């Protein structure tokens, strides 16, 4: 069971700075006098860390459910042993496996099951009147659990439950990690005499235990113990005390560290590779001592920002006008067949209008039609009454669907239908439109018939004359101006798209973004995906060329198709980060040198030099740079660059 707290005045969390903290043994191996670099999750040096308060003198009780990232750092400068344990989980509602570490006064157990936590688990400490000792009775951390698969009891660590307000005398650090479902705990007790601003000392954290757990962890909470003496009434509403305590919480991120080992196989110092250029120079040379001279650590490369596309001027269009604006329409049994190819497809006016009645596109989705490029486009056209419009779709059967026009079951095209009653019928009605009622068998899809032979239905032939048991399959339509809506004539145009081995001849429209210049951008001018700047050239092009190369056979000149401008292609920038070092036991600052990148800061002939001040006078030089300019450490005193004296 648990109880809820009341709203009171708290203190906002503050931020402090770490000083060479969060270093542990990354493996279970022995290294003696070895400078070994490994990729593992540590705490970066001089990084922002989260700080919480736990001292009563007011009433600061802040234990939020902080998220669990990849590896955490937990440092506590505990003196009176107020901290008890830690809990972990994801949703904290008895739905997933969740972890419970409580270091109790008798023994340490590690149970991980679906316990039912409250909004703030805590341990209650009471002061007995007859017994002058502190004991813990309020076991309120959860309600109950259903089932689990793992449990572990640790060594019986002895605890003091007396709380005081004095200065801290011990410092405890804890590191919790979870790779591949394995739980890691790293800890080491280091006595110190300090209250705030943790010292710059170094202390590697030895592994403690390696419980295999195999669950997901994303949230965690901190457990604190309060005291109930005779001064407080004893109710957990507004009056309580907790002594003096403080804890720190940090988050680990993957970094590359070079670790120093002694003859005893213990870690002494650590140097980063992505924190300081001096640290990078130290860790690249695999040595803790750097002499004077030039050094190369890594490279420098600029990345593209935008991505511009300028297709050529689209003036090509498909003959979709007269195939829809046709004065005369053929019969259903003699439907027209028109092939459309070698043109840029334009369906925008096809779907932007709404005079049509049917826009059902089988096989392919009409929402993406400008992006699809096809080889052949076919368009049929016939007139059918409003009742026999659903028979056009494949699968359905009927007189029109099986005797005049049949579509395949794997159609990947579109059907366009609209109503035109006044145009297709006068006051007297139309009688020039024919259709088939009878046929020997069914019709295979995409097959039309022109023969108008008398159909016989019986067994006795009629000798090719009009009579009984044989009639005319071809018959006319009767149309009226005042007929029903379903009897009104409708014009149906069917679009068919197919793919063959020939190159695609129909394509959608092409967009064109605005052109920016003098910037490291990416462009695709129909023949290459080139990234670079686009400067203004002074060389004209013959009026038939779109590409352009150089002596080294590299595409470095492409003409803008819409404005007929000649633009050059140039890589943005690349190079390395060279560093000049005064040497060991002489200085600590370095200067960054670029070989050919063009930009305290001095613009030298041999690239860009920063961190070194140029002087006009010339002395003898010791550290070579190039182009008759060296660097030296001269008078405080800083790194100076000057022309070398012969």
């Amino acid at each position: 069971q648990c109880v809820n707290l009341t709203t009171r005045t708290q203190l906002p969390p503050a931020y402090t700075n770490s000083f060479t903290r969060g270093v542990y043994y990354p493996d279970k191996v022995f290294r003696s006098s070895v400078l070994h670099s490994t990729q593992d999750l540590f705490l970066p040096f001089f990084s922002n860390v989260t700080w919480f308060h736990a001292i009563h003198v007011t009433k600061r009780f802040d234990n939020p459910v902080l998220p669990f990232n990849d590896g955490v750092y937990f440092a506590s400068t505990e003196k009176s042993n107020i901290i008890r344990g830690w809990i972990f989980g994801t949703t904290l509602d008895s739905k997933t496996q969740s972890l419970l570490i409580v270091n109790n006064a008798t023994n340490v157990v590690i149970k991980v099951c679906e316990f039912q936590f409250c909004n703030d688990p805590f341990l209650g400490v009471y002061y007995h009147k007859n017994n002058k000792s502190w004991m813990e009775s309020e076991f309120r951390v959860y309600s109950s659990a259903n089932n689990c698969t793992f449990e572990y009891v640790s060594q019986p660590f002895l605890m003091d439950l007396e709380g005081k307000q004095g200065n801290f005398k011990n410092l405890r650090e804890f590191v919790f990690k979870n790779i591949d479902g394995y739980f890691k705990i790293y800890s080491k007790h280091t006595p110190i005499n300090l209250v705030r601003d943790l010292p710059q000392g170094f202390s590697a954290l030895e592994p403690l235990v390696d419980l295999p757990i195999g669950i997901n962890i994303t949230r965690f909470q901190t457990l604190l113990a309060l005291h109930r003496s005779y001064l407080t009434p004893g109710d957990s509403s507004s009056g309580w005390t907790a002594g003096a305590a403080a804890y720190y919480v940090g988050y680990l991120q993957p970094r590359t560290f070079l670790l120093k080992y002694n003859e005893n196989g213990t870690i002494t110092d650590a140097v980063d590779c992505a924190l300081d250029p001096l640290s990078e120079t130290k860790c690249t040379l695999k040595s803790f001592t750097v002499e004077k001279g030039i050094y190369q650590t890594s490279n420098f490369r600029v990345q593209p920002t935008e991505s511009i596309v300028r297709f050529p001027n689209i003036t090509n269009l498909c003959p979709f006008g007269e195939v829809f604006n046709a004065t005369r329409f053929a019969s259903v049994y003699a439907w027209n067949r028109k092939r459309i190819s070698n043109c840029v497809a334009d369906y925008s006016v096809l779907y932007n209008s709404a005079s049509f009645s049917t826009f059902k596109c089988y096989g392919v989705s009409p929402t993406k039609l400008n992006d699809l490029c096809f080889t052949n486009v076919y368009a049929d056209s016939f007139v059918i009454r409003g009742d026999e419009v659903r028979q056009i779709a494949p699968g359905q059967t009927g007189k029109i669907a099986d005797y005049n026009y049949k579509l395949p079951d794997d159609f990947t095209g579109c059907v366009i239908a609209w109503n035109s009653n006044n145009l297709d019928s006068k006051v007297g009605g139309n009688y020039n439109y024919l259709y088939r009622l009878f046929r020997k068998s069914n019709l295979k899809p995409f097959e039309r018939d022109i023969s108008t032979e008398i159909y016989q239905a019986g067994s006795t032939p009629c000798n090719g004359v009009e009579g009984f048991n044989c009639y005319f399959p071809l018959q006319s339509y009767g149309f009226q101006p005042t007929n029903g809506v379903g009897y009104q004539p409708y014009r149906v145009v069917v679009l068919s798209f197919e793919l063959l081995h020939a190159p695609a001849t129909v394509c959608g429209p092409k967009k064109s973004t605005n052109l920016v210049k003098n910037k490291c951008v990416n462009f695709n001018f129909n023949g290459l995906t080139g990234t670079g700047v686009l400067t203004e050239s002074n060389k004209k092009f013959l009026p038939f060329q779109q590409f352009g190369r150089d002596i080294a056979d590299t595409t470095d000149a492409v003409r803008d198709p819409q404005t007929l401008e000649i633009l050059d292609i140039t890589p943005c920038s690349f190079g390395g980060v060279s560093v000049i070092t005064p040497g060991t036991n002489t200085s600590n600052q370095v200067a960054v040198l670029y070989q050919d990148v063009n930009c305290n800061v001095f613009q030298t002939r041999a690239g860009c030099l920063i961190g070194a001040e140029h002087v006009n006078n010339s002395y003898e030089c010791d550290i070579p740079i190039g182009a008759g300019i060296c660097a030296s450490y001269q008078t405080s005193q800083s790194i100076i660059a000057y022309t070398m004296s012969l």
Partner: antibody
Amino acid sequence: EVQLVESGGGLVQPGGSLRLSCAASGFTFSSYWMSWVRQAPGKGLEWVANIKQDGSEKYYVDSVKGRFTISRDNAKNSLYLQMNSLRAEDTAVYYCARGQLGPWVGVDYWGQGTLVTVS
Amino acid sequence: NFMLTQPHSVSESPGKTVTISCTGSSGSIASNYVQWYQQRPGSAPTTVIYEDNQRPSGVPDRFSGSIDSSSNSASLTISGLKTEDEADYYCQSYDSSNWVFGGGTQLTVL
């Protein structure tokens, strides 16, 4: 991410004239279909009107035929909805509905809307 | 005079698959596209199923649709039936230069 802002209501009038506006941003206003959709409080959805991207064609439902008008422009990326001869049935919330290709793709775009009551 | 007929209270079931039917009477709904709209009660509506065979980006796959031309009805199926389903559904087709909307199918008890 497309922002739609509507502020055209907030007052009651019997049989008067009302001015509703939908403001849109984050896309090209002159290349997609547009629509207006209203809902009575506690009732189902129903369609009011639609317009083409260039404003050439404007259609309404037969209930509001004869009255009502809709217009658009692409310079300021805004809509104009004007109403006249209101009735007591017009207590509804109004959404400016954005199209993609035409009347077949679907509405798929609804504003937050503005509460419009008459009394 | 096209209308779309659909119920008002269905799918009051925990954690399984239940289908909702939308049908018309004046004409065939399979000629044009029909769409399903999902509306938050008291806020902006949204859209769950469109194109009869598509769903907006970010929409979970639990929702699915189908077309039965024999009964002239459109079926919307929800599989997960999770805690984020408290809405009323609508069915929308197009006849000729006009739009008709469904009556509404309230779903609150999940």
